[PDB]
Design a protein that fits this description.
homodimer; 503 residues; alpha+beta; Heat Shock Protein 90; Ribosomal Protein S5, domain 2; 3 domains; eight-stranded mixed sheet; six-stranded mixed sheet; 14 helices; binds adenosine-5'-triphosphate; binds magnesium ion; binds zinc ion
């Protein structure tokens, strides 16, 4: 029947702040926007600051990527909280969750073939007009000749006047400047302004102490990881396979696959029952809706609905033939021994980092300096609201216990206890007895550390990860000294890791 | 001007699951419903499991309280995401928690001459393909049980939707849940079609302990009881519990955790963050108040300006209050291994067993010390799940201040002079291990018993009485000064402490 007269769960002003409160990690709030840029299939995100002293915080936070962009339908689907194979976005709210943690308002400029769209979700408009609902101006211009593209001219006029009133771009030419800030035919520019302040009135994002970095505006104690104080260090290891370049203030971050930056990286295949059970659970949930859709078609659109969903059922049963094991990669961190811990990636995105499991939890000299990296998929684990924890805490703890057992196995097979922990760390540049000090940066110790680590670097245009046989600049495969991968059309040489057997 | 034709941000079906994903702590998801019942000024919540084999999980999860209840207006404001000395300020927590526990939830509330059902069912949206979040909202008169609505076809659709997807398939089956509220005002929240684990069992274990709601897992010896037992979690969920928590009809022995500690000393820490956030709160609310009075100078703007100056006059009285943070530190002697900081935000527990200061270092000193702070809402705000804090920098500043106050407390309590291993072993901890419980021998049990005063709560007046030595009344208090329910409530006389 018709439910037009029934009550609907609506949105209010304060729920933007409520959605903002999930991020105790403001770098996680940034990380959700760069996640959306990765979901755009972008080759490059520029995360730069535009100095605007008239706004709160003194500057805007602009997120410019060259991705697929958005049509008016997808742009209208942003403010629909929630959505309808390797993408990060599954919750449909994380842009709104992050941008309100970062700043009071955010304005989104995007472009996709001949339609380019502005999304101006403004909390300052809601304060200054006292409107309880979440009213979002969404005007669309033609991407070539710039006429308004809408079915409601007075609605377009109201939206654009609202943008020129509360946006940092008070004119249509200043809007067009942000629209041609996107260089390609498609892309998205997300500008977050009126940033959150501390008690002293300074913005939380420190962009002044390091001009090539977005920093946490606080002091740095001894035991604080650089990923929680530096967004450069966070975005370097934010992805388990970073194909898209990230530019902070126009400077590319040296991203790294954490498995290749480890001494003796051994790979472990852990057959997870959580992998197998929910892979078997998703095939009956998909077959249940396929049965009711088939009898619904048993007119043309209902038949086509079941026909294009029948191939979805063939895809998930094909995935059952793939073995349900998890890739446990363990390697010793020699460049920083103290920056060890477990780096849990969920569908190639860092959720939990620097986690101590197994004998790392025990207070003791051994099993320290090991970095464990895993890419769990979405059917094994789902992220939390902030994508900094895991929703299934019980099987997350099961994963941590299994990874502790695999850590103990990795520690006993590489035989550091047989060869000596103390002299092993002494010969690798670590002379002081303190754990948290960086190693000695002399020439022989630096060459000893860099001899074990293969130098991996990413090209600028083909975006492939090359290896060099003994704030980065722009790098192409042409100046690779290795003649096997001296061209951009060469196949990307995958990381080769020794295999370890656990029990 | 008018913005009726302008686009609005909407809610979709999958946002209920997205909102549900904020609760890594399922006991936090339960605790949000307990928080809403505390905001109801309920004297008693009832947490009970109604066994229903036709639903997922095998049983219903019921949240019955005798609070203020809801009228149709604030019952409709429940599904308005984001609303409002109350814990609830995010307008979200019931919707996040109930969808963390179960696929659907049906809410029965009653207030004054009216009573209202709130059905929000993800089963209805799944079986009907509904993209939006459609909530049936019928309202009955609390005496005559007639439909109180201006749209009888909408009422018929809402009620038939409840009878189709709710566990209560008839009007009489709905009415049984409506008279399950005993008083004139109250709220019954039913969570059904609960989330299963990998083995198909529900996540909430109600079978191993029939008086408790537990995590359905094998618990190692390092697990805190509040992370695996909802009875132990709701015992310390509030810093001043006037609620009577009832789990499966059994009253939870709640406690203010400060008085259950050996030698508790109080530290009044002057927080500059408390002073600074109060100093911007005074300048912000009058700015809203002065522009509300200008526009009201048409009757709706005066009502907005009257409640704005009510807030504006309230905070000016609170600025002259001493902007200090009350740090309470005590030694946990019934369980040495269950130590750590218990940070309460607006009298609601957020962080449990936080090791700060010398507890961070793996070592023998400052072990067994439990710190308790009632952080106001002016200092910090909770996260989406209310299991962390939004301001991580100021939370870490608070933790460092609590660490240095822990060091001050440790040098104050003179365990630095009376021996470290001679103090713990005479208190029942003969073993060299850390995580084992103390000795159950009678002289050690009585030695631990006489230090902590027995602070237990009456059932009618809800006051906390101390015994000098079940369902308990102030009449069988052996103390002659507090043998009646009309007696003045006696606070804990915890001595003050000074730093440096
Ligand atoms: N910069 C961008 N480029 C392309 N698409 C974008 C961009 N930002 C947002 N989107 C799209 O906008 C929609 C809504 O954004 P949002 O980030 O809230 O959703 P989501 O990525 O699906 O969610 P989440 O990350 O919480 O799972 C998504 O479909 C997302 O793909
Ligand atoms: N058992 C209850 N008794 C009385 N009022 C209730 C009850 N449960 C919910 N409510 C009301 O429901 C409204 C919205 O519910 P919700 O719990 O999401 O809001 P909130 O408590 O303000 O939010 P939060 O706790 O996340 O800050 C609140 O204003 C609250 O008063
Ligand atoms: Mg997203
Ligand atoms: Mg593009
Ligand atoms: Mg709430
Ligand atoms: Zn190349
Ligand atoms: Zn009494």
């Amino acid at each position: 029947t018709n439910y037009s007269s029934l009550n609907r769960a609506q949105l209010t002003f304060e729920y933007l702040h409520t959605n903002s409160t999930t991020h105790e990690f403001l770098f996680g709030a940034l990380a959700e926007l760069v996640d959306n840029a990765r979901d755009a299939d972008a080759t490059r995100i520029d995360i730069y600051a535009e100095r605007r002293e008239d706004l709160r915080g003194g500057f805007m936070l602009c997120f410019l990527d060259d991705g697929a962009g958005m049509d008016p339908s997808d742009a209208a689907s942003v403010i629909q909280f929630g959505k309808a194979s390797t993408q990060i976005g599954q919750y449909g709210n994380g842009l709104k969750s992050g941008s309100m943690r970062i700043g009071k308002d955010f304005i989104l400029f995007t472009k996709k073939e001949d339609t380019m769209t502005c999304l101006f979700l403004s909390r300052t408009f809601h304060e200054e007009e006292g409107i309880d609902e979440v009213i979002v101006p969404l005007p669309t211009w033609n991407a070539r000749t710039r006429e308004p593209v809408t079915d409601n001219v007075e609605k377009f006029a109201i939206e654009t006047e609202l943008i020129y009133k509360y946006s940092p771009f008070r004119t249509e030419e200043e809007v067009m400047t942000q629209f041609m800030k996107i260089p390609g035919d498609s892309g998205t520019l997300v500008i977050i302004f009126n940033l959150k302040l501390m008690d002293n009135g300074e913005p939380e994002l420190d962009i002044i102490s390091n001009p090539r970095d977005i920093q946490m505006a606080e002091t740095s104690p001894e035991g604080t990881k650089p990923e929680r104080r530096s967004f450069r260090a966070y975005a370097a290891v934010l992805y388990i396979d970073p194909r898209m370049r990230i530019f902070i203030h126009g400077h590319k971050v040296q991203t790294k696959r954490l498995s290749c930056c480890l001494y003796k990286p051994r790979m472990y295949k852990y057959t997870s029952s959580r992998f197998k059970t929910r892979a078997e659970q998703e095939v009956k949930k998909a077959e249940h809706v396929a049965r009711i859709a088939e009898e619904k078609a048993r007119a043309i659109t209902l038949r086509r609905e079941a026909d294009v969903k029948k191939r979805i059922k063939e895809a998930k049963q094909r995935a059952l033939k793939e073995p349900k094991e998890l890739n446990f990669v363990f390697g010793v961190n020699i460049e920083h021994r103290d920056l060890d811990g477990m780096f849990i990636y969920n569908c190639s995105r860092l959720i939990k980092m620097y986690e101590k499991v197994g004998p790392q939890l025990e207070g003791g000299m051994a099993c320290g300096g090991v970095v464990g990296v895993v890419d769990v998929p979405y059917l094994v684990l789902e992220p939390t609201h902030n994508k900094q924890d895991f929703a299934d805490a019980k099987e997350y703890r099961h994963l941590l216990r299994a990874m502790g057992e695999h850590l103990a196995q990795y520690w006993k097979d590489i035989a550091i206890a047989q060869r000596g922990i103390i002299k092993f760390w002494d010969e690798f540049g670590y002379l002081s007895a303190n754990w948290n000090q960086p190693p000695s940066s002399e020439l022989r110790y630096k060459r000893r550390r860099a001899m074990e680590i293969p130098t991996t670097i990413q090209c600028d245009l083909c975006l492939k990860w090359r290896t060099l046989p003994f704030y980065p600049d722009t790098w192409v495969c042409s100046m690779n000294p290795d003649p096997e991968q001296d061209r951009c059309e060469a196949s990307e040489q995958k990381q080769k890791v020794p295999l370890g057997t656990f029990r």
